[PDB]
Amino acid sequence: VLRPQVFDAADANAIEEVNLAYENVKEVDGLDVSKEGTEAWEAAMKRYDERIDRVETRITARLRDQLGTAKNA
């Protein structure tokens, strides 16, 4: 849906940001029981979750606009 129906440059930017957050989570992962690795993973997941929150905010704005425009079941 959020991908452009052509061109969605904002969708591409949000996907790139989510991929960068996932790459940070891969580089800094908290699955180890060690506190330092857990904190690095928590910071990477916080950055990825901020990027995902922005992308999902745009997507949910588009979905809310679609639901407001169309009340069809």
41: Cβ contacts below 8 Å, ≥ 6 apart: 25, 28, 29, 30, 31, 32
Experimental method reported for this structure: cryo-EM
Residue 9 CA to chain centroid, in angstroms? 15
CA distance 13 to 58: 11
CA distance 45 to 28: 8
